[PDB]
Homo-oligomer: A and B are copies of this chain.
Amino acid sequence: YEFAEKILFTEEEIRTRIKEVAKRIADDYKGKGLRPYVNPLVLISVLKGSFMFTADLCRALCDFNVPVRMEFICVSSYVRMLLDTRHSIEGHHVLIVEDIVDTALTLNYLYHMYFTRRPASLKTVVLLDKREGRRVPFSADYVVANIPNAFVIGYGLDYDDTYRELRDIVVLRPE
């Protein structure tokens, strides 16, 4: 990548970590009675960044026979909801999917919002976690990779909406 710096995580490394995370999720929900139609694991994907992670994660979950329901939401901050879920999450096992949690301002807002809607359970899975960038305390339930305070792009992550399409996660501005 001539426009960026070193590759932080290759596609194969990301694929491998996602498979392990899906394995852990499958194990953790094994006794929850997840079933298609009535009780699938609801993946609430925060657009735009999580689209790629979501596509790969849902397939890894499928590998472990975990039935899932995909939801896509969109938010904006000046946090307001531009697009919310199409089906009620009440009584369901929900997993909010994000590409990166740094300040945790958005994710914490969404977690609070969904928590009040009476889901059976509510957890979060993030591709990347900059645990040091917090503006509000927030602990994700599943993390694919913890990273330093480096600006990264690729695999859904952007530099002003560009470079989301890269197969690898690359360092634009080091750590």
Contacts and interface: CB of A to CB of B under 8 A. Distances in A.
A112 interface: no
Given A83-B74, A161-B69, A164-B70, A55 B62 contact: no
A48 B74 contact: no
B58 A55 contact: no
B58 A165 contact: yes
Interface residues of A, number: 34
B37 A51 contact: no
Given A72-B72, A83-B83, A59 B165 contact: yes
9 contacts: A37-B162, A47-B72, A51-B54, A55-B56, A59-B165, A62-B165, A68-B164, A70-B164, A72-B72
- List 5 A-B pairs, minimum CB-CB distance, nearest first: A55-B55, A58-B165, A62-B165, A83-B83, A36-B162
